[PDB]
Amino acid sequence: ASVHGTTYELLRRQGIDTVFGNPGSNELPFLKDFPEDFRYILALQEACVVGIADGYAQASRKPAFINLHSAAGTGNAMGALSNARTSHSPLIVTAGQQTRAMIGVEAGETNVDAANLPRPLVKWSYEPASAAEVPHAMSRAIHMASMAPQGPVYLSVPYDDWDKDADPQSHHLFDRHVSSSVRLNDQDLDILVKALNSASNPAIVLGPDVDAANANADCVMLAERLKAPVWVAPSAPRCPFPTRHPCFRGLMPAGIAAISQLLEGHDVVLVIGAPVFRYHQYDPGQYLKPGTRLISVTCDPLEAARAPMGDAIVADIGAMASALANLVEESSRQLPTAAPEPAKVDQDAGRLHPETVFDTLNDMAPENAIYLNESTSTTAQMWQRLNMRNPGSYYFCAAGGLGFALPAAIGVQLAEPERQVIAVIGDGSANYSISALWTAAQYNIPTIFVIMNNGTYGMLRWFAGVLEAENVPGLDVPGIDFRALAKGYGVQALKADNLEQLKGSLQEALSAKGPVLIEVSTVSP
Amino acid sequence: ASVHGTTYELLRRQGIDTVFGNPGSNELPFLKDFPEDFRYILALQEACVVGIADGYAQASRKPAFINLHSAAGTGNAMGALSNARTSHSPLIVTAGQQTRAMIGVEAGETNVDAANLPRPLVKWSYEPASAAEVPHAMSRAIHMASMAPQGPVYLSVPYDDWDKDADPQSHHLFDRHVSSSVRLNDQDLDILVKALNSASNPAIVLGPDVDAANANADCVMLAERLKAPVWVAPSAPRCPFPTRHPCFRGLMPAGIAAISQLLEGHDVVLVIGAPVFRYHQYDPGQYLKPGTRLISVTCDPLEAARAPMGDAIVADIGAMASALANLVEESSRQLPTAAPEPAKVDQDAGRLHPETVFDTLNDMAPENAIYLNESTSTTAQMWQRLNMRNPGSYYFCAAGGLGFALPAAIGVQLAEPERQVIAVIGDGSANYSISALWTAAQYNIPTIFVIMNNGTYGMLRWFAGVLEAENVPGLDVPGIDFRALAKGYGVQALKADNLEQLKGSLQEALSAKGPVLIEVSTVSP
Amino acid sequence: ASVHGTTYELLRRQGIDTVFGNPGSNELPFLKDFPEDFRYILALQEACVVGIADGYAQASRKPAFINLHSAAGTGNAMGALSNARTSHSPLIVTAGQQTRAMIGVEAGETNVDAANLPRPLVKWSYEPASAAEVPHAMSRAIHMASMAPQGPVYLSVPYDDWDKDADPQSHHLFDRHVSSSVRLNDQDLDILVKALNSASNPAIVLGPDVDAANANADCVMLAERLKAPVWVAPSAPRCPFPTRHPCFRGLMPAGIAAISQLLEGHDVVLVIGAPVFRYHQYDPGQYLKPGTRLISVTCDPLEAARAPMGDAIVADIGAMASALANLVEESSRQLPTAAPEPAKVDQDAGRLHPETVFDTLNDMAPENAIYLNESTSTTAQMWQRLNMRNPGSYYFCAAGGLGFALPAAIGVQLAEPERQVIAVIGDGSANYSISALWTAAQYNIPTIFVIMNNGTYGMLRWFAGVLEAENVPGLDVPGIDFRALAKGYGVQALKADNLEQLKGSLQEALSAKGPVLIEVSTVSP
Numbered sequence A, B, C: 001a002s003v004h005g006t007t008y009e010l011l012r013r014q015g016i017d018t019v020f021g022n023p024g025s026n027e028l029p030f031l032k033d034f035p036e037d038f039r040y041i042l043a044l045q046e047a048c049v050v051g052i053a054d055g056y057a058q059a060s061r062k063p064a065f066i067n068l069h070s071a072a073g074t075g076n077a078m079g080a081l082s083n084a085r086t087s088h089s090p091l092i093v094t095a096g097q098q099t100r101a102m103i104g105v106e107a108g109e110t111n112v113d114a115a116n117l118p119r120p121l122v123k124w125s126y127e128p129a130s131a132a133e134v135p136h137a138m139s140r141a142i143h144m145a146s147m148a149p150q151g152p153v154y155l156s157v158p159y160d161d162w163d164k165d166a167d168p169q170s171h172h173l174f175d176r177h178v179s180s181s182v183r184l185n186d187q188d189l190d191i192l193v194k195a196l197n198s199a200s201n202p203a204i205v206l207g208p209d210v211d212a213a214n215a216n217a218d219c220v221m222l223a224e225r226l227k228a229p230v231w232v233a234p235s236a237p238r239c240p241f242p243t244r245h246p247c248f249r250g251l252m253p254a255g256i257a258a259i260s261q262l263l264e265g266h267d268v269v270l271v272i273g274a275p276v277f278r279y280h281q282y283d284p285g286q287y288l289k290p291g292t293r294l295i296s297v298t299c300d301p302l303e304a305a306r307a308p309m310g311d312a313i314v315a316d317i318g319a320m321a322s323a324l325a326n327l328v329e330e331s332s333r334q335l336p337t338a339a340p341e342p343a344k345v346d347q348d349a350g351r352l353h354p355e356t357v358f359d360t361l362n363d364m365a366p367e368n369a370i371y372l373n374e375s376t377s378t379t380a381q382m383w384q385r386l387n388m389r390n391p392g393s394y395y396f397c398a399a400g401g402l403g404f405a406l407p408a409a410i411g412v413q414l415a416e417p418e419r420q421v422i423a424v425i426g427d428g429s430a431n432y433s434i435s436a437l438w439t440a441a442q443y444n445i446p447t448i449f450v451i452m453n454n455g456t457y458g459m460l461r462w463f464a465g466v467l468e469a470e471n472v473p474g475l476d477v478p479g480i481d482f483r484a485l486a487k488g489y490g491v492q493a494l495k496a497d498n499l500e501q502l503k504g505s506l507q508e509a510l511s512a513k514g515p516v517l518i519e520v521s522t523v524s525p
């Protein structure tokens, strides 16, 4: 048995059947003799490769296996890896190293000081000291990505290892089951339950690790029993709660004073599967107002440590949420009132307001639609106007790194073939990972890409306003033809310059068998 | 309120009342105005400082706070930190940085690229970007050390920060409670319980995290109910089980084939709070023999990932052990038979066999004695001949780094004033952290230090034999007077050149009110 | 030919005949079959090992080869390595790694993420990917330490590599000669020469790289021709100039305003082989006063980049100094006047003033004495009172890390057997690397150790004053018997409680054939 054979046996035994990658010389000895039960998804740039794997990993709730070329390939993917870290995405990142004999003289394609390259974004980074170690290194990689808190890992492999004899004792790796499905002990759980039952005006804040766990239904159960309003934590990479449920209060303000003021009057605030908290607007003030106690359930020690206030419990979100919801008493308090219908905004038969685009998608798109967002100006309106009833219905770059939603959209669609993926992407964001379009076309992945063309980096023009920053160059991105780029990568090119054109374009893309791009003319503020 | 005042309020509110350190210029602004409710333990070298803190941390089962000087002080402690990593010791390591204005030009005492220095040994390493951040950084440090898996952390602080205004919102830090007291969910725990109840010839292996958790009594309960033999995992940094209990099988062989052969016939092998496994002799073969399934409970994802075989569960050892022992059925199988009494070895009235020294200590030393071991030749005999009935009765350098047991002995004794600490230290090991003796004397810490003088690095002469390595220089360490060194640091100097002299010396040291060193003439093999 | 044989052939062919080390399991396969033409110097702790190598490297002006054990040994030496960085000391640091088969499971003595450990202090850190690479890695290590700027390097080697077949093509390594003996091109050198010739009131500042280059005589030539005063740069790790030469102005003040004021009136200030500048007192003000231009010749890009003012030239100090001194014109200006004789200080027949100790050493000690200083309170007086006529006559911890001068003293003495080494070490500093004494005794190295016992960390009591920091714990170190510690390691123990006792003790130590320690009772300020 070779290192090659043993590695592919371990992958399949660990439930991996897919390889996301961009090939190169150092990967050919791993990629040759490709098993019939595996499939390779090619992307044209390593940002795109990882972004696709990311979406696939996040929607599947399983490890995604990546294979990149040396330093240059790993490097090209580092922005994408910055999103995977905050996402807690289980990404197994492998990269071909030059032969052991050639590393010393630093021959072309040598990854110098390989394990340092992807730091500090990965939970684990390693290059084995012998070819027989490679399978054992892969085992650690697989388990390091899948254990709470989940995240990207990095394995560098000299290309001459693949053909060498595997250690026969590597077979003990194949069926290893590692569990982190843990929850607070009975004594301390009862105390926390007793404090939730005796809370007067309880409040709940939910983050991406709830949607990752598919703890959504258990959190609905909890919010009903406690009769408590539910917010999503700021800079939300995912949606952990039905957005039209009576308890849902929508997206939290990203400011310190704003959140404290919001939370004032709530005696107990239970945060689940979110950092405390991903602020971005610097709006200073009190973290919490007097009378408000905060308890945080997180899968990430880092999150527990950095919280500027409140108690924390480090545990698996599924296990905690399941236990919390079954143990908690039924309050005789009244269920909070559903949020009102959004205002229909003023719309002429010219350029489309984003508010109009979102209303149209809510009306036309399937009830089990999956949305992705890289339209940075319009995030608030999209959370208000899209009714997302089910889990895994929203993805947004977790560390704010643009070039996620386009490839990720393809990865989600591949992971969820029965669910229509609709990526709403700003004219600016579309360019970062534009070559990802090709993959949707080559593997007939029917992702819909909705380009919001306001001819500008709108979120930055807004930020410059708040900052009162004038004479900033490079805020405008005119002279981009998105129908020409879609055609460039073999993706069907529709347009919508008005409401009737958007209704018809949408209707067309829904029933289209392949990927469709819709270039939307939107109002420039 | 200054950063100084807020930091000392957070320490005391987080339960810290002691500072282990060696001072320097960059630490004076932190160390000035020293609160009455705190105490400073001075050591003369930073290896000694950390080793003392380590012992104190390990015996107390609480964070120990350290304060060292810049790069040079941190650097001097790095060997000691290598032991703390494997130990899972909650060590809060702080180090004075030069003023923010002086860092740029790299003025004398500037710690260049500070957070990188102690990597890769620490769980967390940081230098704050502003003086107002320091308290928040300390909060993260405290929680990063105390959360499972416990371990050393590193905070670098520019010395001009201490006097600056603290952020008033830092008060939210003071009372933060972070829990990792977690255990496997009911459904998967029941499955594991069902497999332990239905095991034919169950086996148990215990590691240092059991003694850390004080999970010892729960593991005795478990071994009785399962009627199963109990080994300690190899390179044991601690003792997790009464060594004269009917089930105790002693220390495991550190080889692959040896352990597999040992485990052959055991259908289920439950490992708790140990890596799988800390081999040192390279004796190759099968990891496990057919018919043997391995389940590992560990507090450390790293341990779970790197295990070359078996299932793993990442959770708190106290919570897992408590749950396992109460849920498990009472087997109607017969309790395993106590191990035989050790053979008394041949002894004349000249140089002492280590076997004799250990028999003498077992007879004379209190039932609740705490032992430390840095006598690398004689570890096996010491495990066989010392009856350790209680928790926290054994410490041994976890990563094998010499210069731990002498300072650690002082730290344990300070943490456990009602328990006689007896450090059995080889002539070789004694030198690494020799200046630690002074601290025992300056703070009247009645640690007994037993120096095994065979005039050589015995373990290395043995290793060179196994390797058949000849003409190795520097294996012998003649011409060391340990009574002169003890006097050098104000520690009472006894000797034992025969059995009667060892009996009387021991009797004297037991009733001595201060630290005693006993130089023992032992047989050179 | 094995990796072992080829490595020892490369060392000897590269001019290495000495191994400084503390052994362990992972080093036995390198250390076995020790060649007859090599010698091993054992130290009892890795701080001591490196400190000895450091002194030897600095006095010899050649690479020193070190061999430590895994993480714990490397770690123990990290403080010492922090001094070697600022020193630009050519230290080849090797450390035994566990076998390639055992690294994966992290068996006892495994150095985890080995090359990261000694960062950020080393110029180069590496673990080879194959046993056949080891010789090539050693070649890089040797050349990376010896090229300007010189500094410590780190090589980690799995212990099973040593016995494996070497690549025959490794023979090309043996005789490789790498040169950095470079100087500014003629056109730019002429411009700089023209600006030195046309300078009105030129000034010269010299640093440790001048003494490293043995550029001392060329810098005397330069100072005579320019008729310019010569200072030594602050925090001086070495002495680059005869201290009783008419031009010598002594040690510079370590403050910004102080140095600028000092330099005011000097139209051109030429700094050679020094950082610009190693400030420690934060005394703010102007870096340079108007009318003062600064030109810096340094061997270190880092030094060139971080200078807050002036022009820099990155080149070899020997080559630059030699060229500068031969090209420069003979000024018809008058030679600066020799500094006055120091004041004899008030002395009774009780405890000795440091001023008295230094006057006594100047009178009695040989003209070609080598001094080392770890008496942190008394540095200024020692520079004023010791006439150092020759190169390599002064060493002081370069990064201020205590535990350098005691081992370094032994290394210097071994490198310079015809020159009496006299280490003046504070009561505090003596403890950091106290076990180094044994090596002086075991290899009969006749280093004289002069312990300045004021029973305190004097420099820290002074610093706390300047800072007006009160109630600082751990500033006092009473109850240390240094004659007992010397005896402990077999070193002859003299004392001096008054002047007559110091005169006689000194006279005795000078003619003693082995190491002598002199415990001096000094006045506590």
Ligand SMILES: Cc1ncc(C[n+]2csc(CCOP(=O)(O)OP(=O)(O)O)c2C)c(N)n1
Binding pocket: A079, A374, A375, A376, A377, A378, A400, A401, A402, A403, A425, A426, A427, A428, A429, A430, A432, A452, A454, A456, A457, A458, A459, A460
């Ligand atoms: C890789 C990367 N580069 C730059 C940014 C900064 N950034 C945040 S939003 C934004 C503008 C995006 O514009 P567009 O996609 O047109 O959306 P709009 O703001 O107009 O809705 C930019 C450049 C980033 N987050 N990531």
Ligand SMILES: Cc1ncc(C[n+]2csc(CCOP(=O)(O)OP(=O)(O)O)c2C)c(N)n1
Binding pocket: B079, B374, B375, B376, B377, B378, B400, B401, B402, B403, B425, B426, B427, B428, B429, B430, B432, B452, B454, B456, B457, B458, B459, B460, C022, C023, C024, C025, C069, C072, C073, C076
């Ligand atoms: C810091 C460090 N340096 C070196 C070693 C390697 N080492 C392991 S055991 C040993 C010998 C210790 O001798 P001693 O304390 O006399 O005990 P003995 O073997 O004679 O019982 C050495 C040097 C180590 N583990 N740590």
Ligand SMILES: Cc1ncc(C[n+]2csc(CCOP(=O)(O)OP(=O)(O)O)c2C)c(N)n1
Binding pocket: B022, B023, B024, B025, B069, B072, B073, B076, C079, C374, C375, C376, C377, C378, C400, C401, C402, C403, C425, C426, C427, C428, C429, C430, C432, C452, C454, C456, C457, C458, C459, C460
């Ligand atoms: C490893 C290390 N720890 C601590 C310090 C801080 N420090 C600088 S000088 C000093 C006091 C040294 O005292 P001693 O050797 O007695 O000399 P004195 O000041 O009394 O002359 C200390 C601890 C340091 N530089 N390096």
Ligand SMILES: [Mg+2]
Binding pocket: A426, A427, A428, A452, A453, A454, A455, A456, A457, A458
């Ligand atoms: Mg835009």
Ligand SMILES: [Mg+2]
Binding pocket: B426, B427, B428, B452, B453, B454, B455, B456, B457, B458
């Ligand atoms: Mg010994």
Ligand SMILES: [Mg+2]
Binding pocket: C426, C427, C428, C452, C453, C454, C455, C456, C457, C458
């Ligand atoms: Mg002193």
